[PDB]
Amino acid sequence: QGGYGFAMRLKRRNWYPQAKEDEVKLDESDWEATGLPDEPKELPKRQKSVIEKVETDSDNNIYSSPYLKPQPKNQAKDYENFKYVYSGWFYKHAKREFNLKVEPKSAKNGDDGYIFYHGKEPSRQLPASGKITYKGVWHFATDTKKGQKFREIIQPSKSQGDRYSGFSGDDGEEYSNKNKSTLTDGQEGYGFTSNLEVDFHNKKLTGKLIRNNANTDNNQATTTQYYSLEAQVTGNRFNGKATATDKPQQNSETKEHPFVSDSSSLSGGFFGPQGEELGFRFLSDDQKVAVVGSAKTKDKKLTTVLDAVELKLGDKKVQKLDNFSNAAQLVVDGIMIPLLPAFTRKFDHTPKTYEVEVCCSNLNYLKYGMLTRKNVEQSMFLQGERTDEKEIPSEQNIVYRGSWYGYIANDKSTSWSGNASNATSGNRAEFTVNFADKKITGTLTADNRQEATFTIDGNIKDNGFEGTAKTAESGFDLDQSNTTRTPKAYITDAKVQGGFYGPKAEELGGWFAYPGDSGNSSATVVFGAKRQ
C-alpha cells in the first residue's frame, strides 16, 4: 500500500426508526491518508480540520490522546517517548442531528473524531539480525449497530456501539488503568498497549495487543489480551494478520467486547534511522473493529533495505528521498507519484507541477531518471528495493546491461547531458560483477560515442557497492562536432554508490555527483542495469 499515516472516521448511526439504518459497518474505503507530518505529536492536519468544521454544539474543545500535543496516561513504560511515529485519537462532542423534513428522516447523536497513526522518515536501513522488543500503544474504533460492549466502554450511556462508534478514548470507558498511578503489578503500562517482537533475521513480526486493567475483579486479570499479531517484514513495511484472542468459541454466545474477529490486513512500517519505531493498522473481516497503534524500543550491526536519492542538477550533495520499499512509487515533498499506468516514459503529475522521465520498463525493483518540478528546478533520482544480504549470489562473473542519465559540464565551457536509452547507439552501461572476489567493473558510454565515457571500479559490500568513477585520461569531450581546442570535462575520482536490487540481485544501480563534499569539471549521473 504505502503511506505516511492513516486515519479513520468515527461513525454515527441514524438511530431514527422507520428509516431503519440499524447497521453502519466500517470499510477499507474509509481509511484516509494523513500526509507527512511536520511534527508527529500534532494531529493529522487534513482531518483535524474536518473536525473543527463540526458544528459543534454546546462544547467545542478537541480532546486527544494524552501524549499528543495540540490526568490519563497511555504508555508502554520505558517505551516511552516516541520521536518518529504517533498513533491516537482525537474528538469533540458533535451536535445532535434531528430532521423530520428530510427523507429518510434522520437522527444522530454522539462524538465525532478519528483514530490515526502517522510517521516521519520511513526507514532506510534496519538491523541485520536478532529479535528486538517493540512496545507501544493502540487504539480501536467500532462500527455501529444495536450495542454494546459492557466489557471495556462503560455503561452504554451515550449508546457507544449503538448510536456512535466508541473507541480507545471515549469518556466513557474506564476499565483500563489509565487514571491509576501505580503499575498493575502485571506490568506493561497504562492504557491499551502493545508488546511486539521483531525477528529481523527471519523477517518476522509477532506480538500482542493487551489492555492493562483498572482492577482484578471479574474472573480476570491484571492484563487482558485482545489481539495477537503476526507479520512478515518486507522492506520497511510489514503485512499480515491480526488474530482475535477472545473469540466467541461456541458461536451460541456473544462476548461483551468487539474484539471477536481476526484481521487479514494488518499493515505497517518502520520509521527512524534503524526502524526503531513502527506504526500499523488493521480492519477486521467482520468490518466491525478498526485498530491503529505504534511501538518503540527503550531509551536509558545494520543492513540497508532500500536506496532513494535525489541528485540536484548540478550539486555536490546527494539528497535522500523517503520511500516505502516500493521502487515503482516516488515519494517527494510528501506527495506520492506512481511510475506506472515503451522503454522510458515521461509524464506530468499535478497533485504544483511535477515532470518525471522514468526508466526503465525492463526493470521491476529499480527505477531511476529525471525529476523536474515547476511552480523550473531539475534533478535526477534513483529508487530501488535492495536484495537481501543473505540473497546476494556467490558466483563469479555476472554481466549486467542497462543505461543512464548524465549531466556533464565544464564551468568555463559548455555542457553535455544524455538520457537513458535502449537504442544500440544511445546512452548505455555494462557491468561485470564478481561476487566472492567482491568486485564490480563496468562502463558508462555516452550516446553516439564509441569510447567509454566513464569507467567504473569499486567494491561490493553486503547488498551494495561503493567505488570510483573516472572519465578517459584524455578527458571527456562535450560537443564532438567542435574540432578545436575547447571543452573539456575532466572527472577524476568521482564517488559512486550503488546497491543490488530484488529477489536475487537481478538488477543493480548507482549514482554519483562530482565533485562531492579548484577545478571546473562537473558531473551528476544515475544508472541502472539488468542481469543478462
TrEMBL record:
Topology term for the membrane: Lipid-anchor
Domain Transferrin-binding protein B C-lobe/N-lobe beta-barrel stretches: 126-296, 392-531
A GO CC term attached to the entry: cell surface
Subcellular locations according to the entry: Cell outer membrane; Cell surface
Alphabetical list of Pfam families matching this protein: TbpB_A (PF17484), TbpB_B_D (PF01298), TbpB_C (PF17483)
Ranges of residues in domain Transferrin-binding protein B N-lobe handle: 1-123
Broad class of the protein's primary localization: membrane
Cross-referenced SUPFAM superfamilies: OMPA-like
Chain coiled-coil ranges: none
Swiss-Prot/TrEMBL keywords: Cell outer membrane, Lipoprotein, Membrane, Palmitate, Signal, Virulence
UniProt biased composition (Basic and acidic residues): 38-47
Region (Disordered): 21-47, 153-186, 239-268, 518-532
Descriptive protein name: Transferrin-binding protein B
Name of the coding gene: tbpB
